[PDB]
Structure 1
Amino acid sequence: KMAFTLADRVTEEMLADKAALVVEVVEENYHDAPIVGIAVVNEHGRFFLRPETALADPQFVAWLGDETKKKSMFDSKRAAVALKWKGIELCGVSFDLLLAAYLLDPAQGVDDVAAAAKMKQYEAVRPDEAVYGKGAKRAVPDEPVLAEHLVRKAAAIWELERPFLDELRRNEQDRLLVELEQPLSSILAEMEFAGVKVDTKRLEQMGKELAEQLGTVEQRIYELAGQEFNINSPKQLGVILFEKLQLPVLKKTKTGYSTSADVLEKLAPYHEIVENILHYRQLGKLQSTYIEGLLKVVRPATKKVHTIFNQALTQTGRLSSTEPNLQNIPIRLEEGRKIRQAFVPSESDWLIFAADYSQIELRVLAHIAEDDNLMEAFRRDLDIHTKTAMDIFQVSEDEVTPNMRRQAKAVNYGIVYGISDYGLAQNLNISRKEAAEFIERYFESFPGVKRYMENIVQEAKQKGYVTTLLHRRRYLPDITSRNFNVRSFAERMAMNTPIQGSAADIIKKAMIDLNARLKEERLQAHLLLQVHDELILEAPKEEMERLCRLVPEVMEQAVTLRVPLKVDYHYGSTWYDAK
């Protein structure tokens, strides 16, 4: 039972200085997507408005963009961006129920108002899926049904705001919401709407040459195999490798023989075909995903791609990036790295500027573990991979070979990911006895880290959750499971999540701080992407000088740890060249 006005014009009482607001975009990808309905709940009542009416109404547009008129919403970034595409500015968002629910427990996977309302036993609203349907059945219902749904969602936000704020404050997470996640949401909205320009002529030429190369590699594979087969089918491949060519079976999964890259690499002393197959599968992912998949999402008139940064998805506090994912563009092998030449500035005589934190997760470990040996290495700015190599090989710095440093590098990050002697041995393709010694030597050399790893797991068991620098939480109900596998996975999460999550906290704050400084100085430079521990901007070439000092400073000073933060930076004519 919920009364509301299905309005056909906007009225003054709909424009109160505090309201719950629903601006409904039903398509998952909200870029240039239709706004299907609006609802407003406030001191005076409950209202549904037709977009065609309200978004052409100067009074309502004015209210939307009035920062002193405060709106509570769910997924305000979706609304903000969909309104940008309609040429309308949204300001004054003071509470976002999606972000509030996300901070309280990311494991719930809240992605609609009803799922958030369930956290407080509020059931006077339906799930979106129930109203719109699934898949090919998805559709906007008749107006009265749509209107009641939107109003119920607004009414839920109105009543849930204080309960959610109260619990966040209780959890030491209220400032995390209002001073970090909510401001970051507006910045992400800017980045998404701006998009990144693509050189489609270059990308298409790369595609044509790549198709040629693919065919050649493919034919060479069939010649080595003695037969044609679908190389992209691990099942057919497994038959060729492990039945026809009788290569050793190093690993199986529940579906059959493994053909993972790690396995195929280890089979190179038995047959040369496995190196060719690895190459083929690399080339084929470049073609399918970074040529074809990317061209499919380029907006043809502007040649821009517009990612969506999911801010309320990951369990650690990171962002993710979808349709397209611009956080996994190739860089590690030169063949793929060239894809980055197709990402260019949106204006003439602008440049790409890219800044990355150096070893942020190891510095966070050093801080949280309060390990003096690790802290001192960073204080002196010694190479942390070379230092570990000295300890695990038990040699002097001069005796550390590049391959020893490489193995020490694997130990350094592997510790942060909970690696075992088995995993390390497989990773480095070395003796498991030697891998085990590397790890023992590591923990003997960094006792503060050993103690931290022990202590954090105990804390998780005692409290039921672990926390980051800025009070983000992750609950770990499995941490006391009697089952070894389930428990071990949760213990590794206890070790890793505070580290990855704290690093997330830092760069998020850096983005807020950097943006403030950009606007203060009236620079034209602006953010395009975040890639976990790096920030990518574009700017007129004239501003590089300033950015070279401003960006690293702001990023290094975002938070103060017990070790210093270090940021590297580069710029150039394309993303590729910003190296």
Structure 2
Amino acid sequence: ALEEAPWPPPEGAFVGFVLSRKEPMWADLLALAAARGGRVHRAPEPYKALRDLKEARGLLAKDLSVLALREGLGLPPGDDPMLLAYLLDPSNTTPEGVARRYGGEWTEEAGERAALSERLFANLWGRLEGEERLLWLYREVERPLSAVLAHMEATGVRLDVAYLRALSLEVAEEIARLEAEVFRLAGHPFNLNSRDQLERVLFDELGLPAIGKTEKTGKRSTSAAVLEALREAHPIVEKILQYRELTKLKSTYIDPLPDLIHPRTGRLHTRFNQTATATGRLSSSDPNLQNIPVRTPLGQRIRRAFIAEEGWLLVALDYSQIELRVLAHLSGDENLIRVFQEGRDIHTETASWMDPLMRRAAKTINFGVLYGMSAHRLSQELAIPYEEAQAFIERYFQSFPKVRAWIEKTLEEGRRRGYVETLFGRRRYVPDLEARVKSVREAAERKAFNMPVQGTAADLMKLAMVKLFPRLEEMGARMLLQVHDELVLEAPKERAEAVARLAKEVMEGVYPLAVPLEVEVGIGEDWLSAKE
């Protein structure tokens, strides 16, 4: 039954706020409230009232801190019950669910939100009493990380807009040429973007063999894997693949990115969602800057668009074979430890076995292999017979015997405890491990043993970001992007070299393992340059 108390609130109050739209960098601050000591404070003018707070503590703290940074204010995020709930159970991803689950309702009014924040925090902090590992992750990783992300989000990254505009006009001309071919070959026009219309053309009119069907609705699939299986079975398939690539990059990146430049900053701002994934990874959205193309020649042209402020350079740091090293440490496989203790590369060894484009393939291969891929799909990818695909799966695990033993212990443990955990104790609940439908059970198993490996690499990286960020600010350098095992920094030209050495070392020393973490670093005027 909170009481209206005059703004401002006492120091250390829980904040509620309402935004015109989810994106902090783009939102209007509609309302701002705070709660403390059995009272609620509703600010008369939200923007002015921001100045009174000294830290944002409450649901979605980082977002409001991001909006504060955009206004020239340094209001860092503090406690956020979402981070508590997320650590308790990573399926806790939204305030709607968290409130439903731990004792309130997520409404649209800042006061009730500030109130909700306060009681949700009490209750969750209660639930976390005694979970000392999760408390450690909260204090040493997540809560400090929120500040770092708020700064990355507010900073943004520079984009060569004029370049992409020109690229759009070029690519559009290429697409029209391929559309025309496809339409001719099909003997009539139709919407090449409609997978439904395409399917009737390929499998009914052209009478091509229907490899596979789609998951939910059982239509005949027109996916790249299926089209690749028909690249020589007919010429029109080939062009379809190329129309898909261009339209995919044009409509997802080339055309939308330029129109998202912020007016005040002149830069492009993503959101780094901190309670979004089941393994502990971050995600990026609005726009997603974690899937900017890079694997093909055209995508590379897109990456070139991401450039440094004049007088600065981008610094790109990227852990080598990160999840493999984690697997060595997690499992104890001596043969795999040695692989890394003596500077061996097995992403390059799976390339010649099966340059920069051939190494990306061995990356899809050795990772697909490792996480329970099927002999069937491996045979199909590598273009070899099923007989040969099983032997790359026999040897790939013969070499490193303790991995399978680790997989088993992990699954056995997740069955008893109902969850699996990373090196630091981050939990993921995986209930279907005792499912009586084999398929459902074995999916769960693949989810279960991947988590500690992907989630440990994410713990390490978050920790590296937490340690590295203070050093960058004191050097006048900036942290721009994180792509799971990678960081892009922006540095004044004359500090760029020292920043790279420093960041490389911080990341490599984040938390020593039974195997060394190695980092590749590069420096350049654009994101593509910085990774050569």
Match of 2:64 in 1: 79
Match of 1:531 in 2: 483
| TM value normalised by structure 2 | 0.93
Is the Cα–Cα contact under 8 Å of residues 40 and 115 in structure 2 kept in the other structure? Answer: no
Give, as a single letter, the amino acid of the residue that structure 1 aligns with 2:33: A
| TM value normalised by structure 1 | 0.86
1:120-139 per-position Cα deviation (integer Å, ceiling 9, x unaligned):
4x2xx3233xxx4xxxxxxx
1:491-528 per-position Cα deviation (integer Å, ceiling 9, x unaligned):
00112111110110111111111112223xx3121110
Shift of residue 428, structure 1, vs aligned partner: 2.1
Q: 1:474 to 1:278 in 2, by over 3 A?
A: same
Between the aligned partners of 1:574 and 1:362, the Cα distance in structure 2 is 29
Gaps in structure 2 of 5+ consecutive residues: none
Between the aligned partners of 1:308 and 1:407, the Cα distance in structure 2 is 30
Q: 1:161 to 1:51 in 2, by over 3 A?
A: farther
Matches within 5 A, 1:76-155: 76-91=61-76, 93-109=77-93, 111-112=94-95, 115-120=97-102, 122=103, 125-128=104-107, 132=108, 146=109, 149-155=112-118
Between the aligned partners of 1:401 and 1:282, the Cα distance in structure 2 is 25
Q: 1:368 to 1:529 in 2, by over 3 A?
A: same
Match of 1:231 in 2: 192
Q: 1:409 to 1:85 in 2, by over 3 A?
A: closer
Is the Cα–Cα contact under 8 Å of residues 417 and 496 in structure 1 kept in the other structure? Answer: yes
What is the root-mean-square deviation in Å for CA atoms of aligned residues? 2.3
Shift of residue 50, structure 1, vs aligned partner: 2.1
- Which stretch of the first structure deviates more once superposed, 543-552 or 465-474? 543-552
1:444-496 per-position Cα deviation (integer Å, ceiling 9, x unaligned):
22211121112211111111110011211100111100001110111001121
Where 1:172 maps in the other structure, the secondary structure is helix
Match of 1:557 in 2: 509
Q: 1:386 to 1:33 in 2, by over 3 A?
A: closer
Shift of residue 443, structure 1, vs aligned partner: 2.1
Aligned residues: 528
Shift of residue 336, structure 1, vs aligned partner: 1.4
Is the Cα–Cα contact under 8 Å of residues 41 and 158 in structure 1 kept in the other structure? Answer: no
Match of 1:140 in 2: none
Between the aligned partners of 2:334 and 2:195, the Cα distance in structure 1 is 47
Is the Cα–Cα contact under 8 Å of residues 18 and 110 in structure 2 kept in the other structure? Answer: no
Shift of residue 158, structure 1, vs aligned partner: 5.3
Match of 1:284 in 2: 247
Between the aligned partners of 2:28 and 2:197, the Cα distance in structure 1 is 44
Give, as a single letter, the amino acid of the residue that structure 2 aligns with 1:15: P
Match of 2:458 in 1: 504
Work out whether 1:212 is the aligned partner of 2:173.
Answer: yes
Is the Cα–Cα contact under 8 Å of residues 24 and 79 in structure 1 kept in the other structure? Answer: no
Gaps in structure 1 of 5+ consecutive residues: 133-145, 390-398
Give, as a single letter, the amino acid of the residue that structure 1 aligns with 2:505: E
Is the Cα–Cα contact under 8 Å of residues 361 and 500 in structure 1 kept in the other structure? Answer: yes
Match of 2:39 in 1: 46
Work out whether 1:5 is the aligned partner of 2:4.
Answer: yes
Shift of residue 369, structure 1, vs aligned partner: 1.2
1:62-111 per-position Cα deviation (integer Å, ceiling 9, x unaligned):
x523x6xxx641111011012223332214x54210111011101233x1
Match of 2:257 in 1: 294
Q: 1:72 to 1:323 in 2, by over 3 A?
A: closer
Between the aligned partners of 1:411 and 1:291, the Cα distance in structure 2 is 29
Between the aligned partners of 1:388 and 1:263, the Cα distance in structure 2 is 24
Q: 1:259 to 1:151 in 2, by over 3 A?
A: closer
Q: 1:332 aligns with which of 295, 298, 309?
A: 295
Match of 1:460 in 2: 414
Work out whether 1:266 is the aligned partner of 2:260.
Answer: no
Where 2:25 maps in the other structure, the secondary structure is coil
Counting aligned pairs with the same residue, the percent is 42
Asked which structure has the greater CA Rg, the reply is 1
Q: 2:332 aligns with which of 361, 370, 375?
A: 370
Between the aligned partners of 1:313 and 1:219, the Cα distance in structure 2 is 42
